[PDB]
Amino acid sequence: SGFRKMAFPSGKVEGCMVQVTCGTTTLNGLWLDDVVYCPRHVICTSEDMLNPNYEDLLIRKSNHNFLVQAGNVQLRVIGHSMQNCVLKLKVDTANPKTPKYKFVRIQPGQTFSVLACYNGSPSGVYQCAMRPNFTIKGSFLNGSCGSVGFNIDYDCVSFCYMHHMELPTGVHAGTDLEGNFYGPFVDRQTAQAAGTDTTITVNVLAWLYAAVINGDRWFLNRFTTTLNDFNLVAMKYNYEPLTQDHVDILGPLSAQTGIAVLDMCASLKELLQNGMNGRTILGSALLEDEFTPFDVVRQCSGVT
Amino acid sequence: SGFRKMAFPSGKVEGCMVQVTCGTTTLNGLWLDDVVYCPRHVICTSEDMLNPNYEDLLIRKSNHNFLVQAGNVQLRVIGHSMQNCVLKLKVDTANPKTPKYKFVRIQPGQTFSVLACYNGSPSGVYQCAMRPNFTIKGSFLNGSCGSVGFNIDYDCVSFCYMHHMELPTGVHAGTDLEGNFYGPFVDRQTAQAAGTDTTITVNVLAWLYAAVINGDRWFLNRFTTTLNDFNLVAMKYNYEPLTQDHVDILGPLSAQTGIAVLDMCASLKELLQNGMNGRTILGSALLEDEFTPFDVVRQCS
Ligand SMILES: *[C@]1(O)C(=O)Nc2ccc(F)cc21
Ligand SMILES: *[C@]1(O)C(=O)Nc2ccc(F)cc21
Ligand SMILES: *[C@]1(O)C(=O)Nc2ccc(F)cc21
Ligand SMILES: [Mg+2]
Numbered sequence: 001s002g003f004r005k006m007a008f009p010s011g012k013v014e015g016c017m018v019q020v021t022c023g024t025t026t027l028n029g030l031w032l033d034d035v036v037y038c039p040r041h042v043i044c045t046s047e048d049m050l051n052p053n054y055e056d057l058l059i060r061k062s063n064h065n066f067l068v069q070a071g072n073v074q075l076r077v078i079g080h081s082m083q084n085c086v087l088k089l090k091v092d093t094a095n096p097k098t099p100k101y102k103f104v105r106i107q108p109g110q111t112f113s114v115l116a117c118y119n120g121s122p123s124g125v126y127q128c129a130m131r132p133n134f135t136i137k138g139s140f141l142n143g144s145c146g147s148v149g150f151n152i153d154y155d156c157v158s159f160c161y162m163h164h165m166e167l168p169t170g171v172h173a174g175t176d177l178e179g180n181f182y183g184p185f186v187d188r189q190t191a192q193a194a195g196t197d198t199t200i201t202v203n204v205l206a207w208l209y210a211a212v213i214n215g216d217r218w219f220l221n222r223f224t225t226t227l228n229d230f231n232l233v234a235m236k237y238n239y240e241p242l243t244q245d246h247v248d249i250l251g252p253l254s255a256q257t258g259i260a261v262l263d264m265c266a267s268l269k270e271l272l273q274n275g276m277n278g279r280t281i282l283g284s285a286l287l288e289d290e291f292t293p294f295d296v297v298r299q300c301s302g303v304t
Numbered sequence: 305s306g307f308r309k310m311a312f313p314s315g316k317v318e319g320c321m322v323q324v325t326c327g328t329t330t331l332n333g334l335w336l337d338d339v340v341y342c343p344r345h346v347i348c349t350s351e352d353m354l355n356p357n358y359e360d361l362l363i364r365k366s367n368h369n370f371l372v373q374a375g376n377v378q379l380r381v382i383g384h385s386m387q388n389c390v391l392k393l394k395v396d397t398a399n400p401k402t403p404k405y406k407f408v409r410i411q412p413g414q415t416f417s418v419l420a421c422y423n424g425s426p427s428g429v430y431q432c433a434m435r436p437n438f439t440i441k442g443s444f445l446n447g448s449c450g451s452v453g454f455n456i457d458y459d460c461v462s463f464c465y466m467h468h469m470e471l472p473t474g475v476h477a478g479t480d481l482e483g484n485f486y487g488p489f490v491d492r493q494t495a496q497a498a499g500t501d502t503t504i505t506v507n508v509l510a511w512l513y514a515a516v517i518n519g520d521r522w523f524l525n526r527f528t529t530t531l532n533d534f535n536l537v538a539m540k541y542n543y544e545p546l547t548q549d550h551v552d553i554l555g556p557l558s559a560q561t562g563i564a565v566l567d568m569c570a571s572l573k574e575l576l577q578n579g580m581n582g583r584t585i586l587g588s589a590l591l592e593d594e595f596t597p598f599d600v601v602r603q604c605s
Contacts, residue, residue: 002443006428011315124310170306285589304425
């Protein structure tokens with residue numbers, strides 16, 4: 001038993017991280033087949049930005065301006081091209097450690113692991129959720145741009161995130177692997193801020209089911225409620241609305257435990273109103289919203 | 305930036321996880337060079353959990369009784385010996401993915417990453433600490449025995465934990481990679497319980513320093529304390545005694561922030577007395593005790 005914030009094994013992604021330098025700017029790139037993917041702002045230098053068209057700066061750059069380091073072997077850049085906010089560097093040699101992979105875009109509330117890297121070298125791995133305000137609460141280290149977020153299915157790595165910037169409130173913003181930003185952000189050095197965040201209701205419920213599976217039951221009660229009644233309570237406590245799809249998703253946990261979703265919502269509605277009264281749930285005095293229903297099932301199953 | 309509980313990249317350990325089967329018992333093994341390390345209770349049947357005679361069970365085993373499987377490939381066992389509570393299976397093939405490694409026995413309060421595995425296949429990685437009662441609060445299902453805990457410092461993997469059992473309270477017990485259990489536990493199904501768990505005081509202090517470094521100061525106060533007066537108060541909240549070694553270890557962080565160690569102790573005393581009053585420190589509503597002084601220093605704080 002036990003429940004922990006659990007990231008995917010990062011080995012398949014570790015074999016993909018390379019160092020990318022252009023001028024003084026050094027960050028991380030993702031080496032798959034013969035392409036290195038990295039944030040396009042690597043080519044920006046503190047003097048040239050005069051309301052630029054990015055392809056103006058890019059067409060001034062030669063292949064040899066891109067120093068790509070895979071550990072110690074230097075990768076020869078033989079082409080460059082822009083894909084939204086991502087820069088695609090064609091290299092002469094394919095990555096022999098390229099895993100089976102796909103580029104996917106995730107929805108807010110979905111979770112993924114991040115392999116925090118510095119100068120092409122993996123430093124740590126953590127599990128996080130795409131917040132409703134399209135940010136993620138991530139790592140401390142500078143020079144982490146180009147670190148990627150991913151999920152693993154069986155053998156297949158689904159890349160969903162590349163880190164681009166830090167926001168003034170300590171959170172991070174990034175794109176999918178096709179360079180499309182998550183959220184209303186731009187990859188320039190201008191003043192931006194995250195919008196007011198909300199709590200991922202369906203994930204909190206999934207975490208409550210995990211607590212029940214692990215013997216934490218004190219918050220259960222005899223009552224049930226309506227999706228209407230609960231969503232009115234959720235909106236006042238800055239919780240995402242709970243849709244009928246969310247209830248269906250929680251179906252398996254509702255069957256494994258005997259606690260119906262609206263039955264469990266009655267427990268959550270009491271918790272939002274009256275608090276925990278000094279008690280904890282799974283060793284926490286806050287309501288955790290960074291476990292999806294399938295995170296709970298996976299961890300309380302044994303999927304490998 | 306934000307302060308995050310980060311596990312080590314698990315790739316170097318992933319390449320060493322294998323599956324070990326004896327009879328109907330299957331668990332995970334650690335394959336390093338030409339040795340596979342695994343918990344010795346893999347040779348226990350049903351009638352062996354309460355009073356296993358491991359020497360008796362082991363003397364009746366041949367090499368071909370041990371089925372080691374690395375991915376799709378079966379490994380051939382050519383020798384076996386027992387070292388304390390771990391089995392050491394010599395195999396015919398050195399693991400080509402063996403990293404630079406060492407075996408380290410850790411002390412309470414130390415942190416490490418755990419690669420949870422099932423049937424020799426890695427399933428997830430998370431960060432743990434050795435509790436003062438020599439247990440860990442992991443996440444382990446049946447089949448996860450033989451999963452290992454480790455740190456990675458400069459491409460060298462230091463293996464410090466191998467999982468052996470779950471206690472009644474839902475916490476977990478295991479050994480170092482030389483097979484010596486952490487704490488007073490044994491690989492018997494007999495009644496044994498963990499000592500009352502306490503808070504790792506030196507870790508909470510270091511976490512408070514990290515909060516100051518990250519710009520959070522609301523919990524500081526005017527007072528200092530003597531070391532002994534601090535420990536008298538903290539024992540009342542089931543906090544671990546703070547030693548002079550703990551004071552010295554925090555020296556760098558005190559210097560970095562200009563807050564004397566015994567000054568931070570006084571603030572922790574007041575936090576215990578006052579609670580948080582709905583506030584948070586580094587995003588948490590409880591006092592976090594699974595970041596070591598070392599962790600916060602090289603978290604570039
Ligand atoms: C460059 O100044 C930078 O850092 N980001 C970016 C985006 C688009 C552009 F045209 C230039 C830059
Ligand atoms: C990015 O290049 C990186 O690695 N760190 C960082 C900090 C701030 C920023 F605007 C961009 C980056
Ligand atoms: C461990 O070997 C495992 O995988 N399951 C299990 C159950 C009970 C026990 F004492 C040890 C283990
Ligand atoms: Mg109820």
